[PDB]
Amino acid sequence: MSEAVKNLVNNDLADVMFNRHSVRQFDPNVKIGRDELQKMIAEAATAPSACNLQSWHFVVVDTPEAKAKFKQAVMKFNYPQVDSASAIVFIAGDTQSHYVYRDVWNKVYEDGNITKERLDQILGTFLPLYENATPDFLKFDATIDCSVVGMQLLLVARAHGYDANAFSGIDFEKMIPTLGLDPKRYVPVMGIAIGKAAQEPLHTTRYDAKTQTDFLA
């Protein structure tokens, strides 16, 4: 069908966004390949981010063993989503994303896409704020980036014909180590559970019973 290859099988914006609902029970018989998961994550990461630092990090949970480990830091209220989802994409904030600030915006200049003067405005203005920032503010900054990419991922999920639930009902003191992520670096934000919505039970047919009946003579 046409709207793929825009690679979006539901490319109707109004339907995708305005008929979006949190789905918490998915069809456990449908699995999403990791290649399509990577595709959806890349599509979501077209999202904006402060100073284009893209301060998000994704951890994909899609095996029974990964789920059992993941659930250690997830509130039991949210076990239905985790158990039934094809995959959970957990989003953590990168509070060291500004370490590459100067190099990154220099690359834009070296590519001839901004003037030297423009580059100097960008470096002069925002880099010192990142460099002198408190932990709380870096966490705040990273949390915003993670939320806008999470929002896009919820839409991307539907554009691929799936559905999804965003959730932050987690153990915030345990999630980062549970994911094996650098606690110095990463802050937990939200999980995105993804899969096919749980459907209505199949209504089966019957042969006409006259076919399976004899009257004895």
Place this chain on the structure above:
Amino acid sequence: LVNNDLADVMFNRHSVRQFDPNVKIGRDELQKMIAEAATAPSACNLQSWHFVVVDTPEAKAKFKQAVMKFNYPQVDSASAIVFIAGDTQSHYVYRDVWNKVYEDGNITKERLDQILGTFLPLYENATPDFLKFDATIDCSVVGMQLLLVARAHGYDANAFSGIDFEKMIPTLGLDPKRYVPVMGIAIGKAAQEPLHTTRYDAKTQTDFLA
């Protein structure tokens, strides 16, 4: 919707900072765009966002007192700016709103009790910082949807947080014990190439004297 192509809207979205200052957006349409954006999810459906629409020279002058000067091109040229602040008292109606979902027949009493017993204590016993974090997340997802809604409507937009975080909420006239500032959404039509005007054929305006 002018542009209902999701791939185009989302994947061809760019931050636009220089808008056409002759183009204005009616407050009626601004309201419709905000409503469309607030279809966004929010934790416990508390919808902990608050919008302050800035669209007059007087309002812009007030607003800029808490905006970094780097972001003046956006604020000055935009048709409107929608600033999004987080409501850290959003959980005050927690019990009431989720009771209502129960009374209207859409959750079981057992389900309501699970919901109330699990998350309501977390909000009521939350640190200021946790309520701030919670409302920031809500504010950011509706902010992301508003960026997309602007393009669906044929406009363009820029999200920005280069502001004075201490001055902004009182600059908006909001209660700083209740509201936390998150980001602005400048909305407008992107600047377009200058008009290439025509000329009369100059022979029409020329005489050769006899």
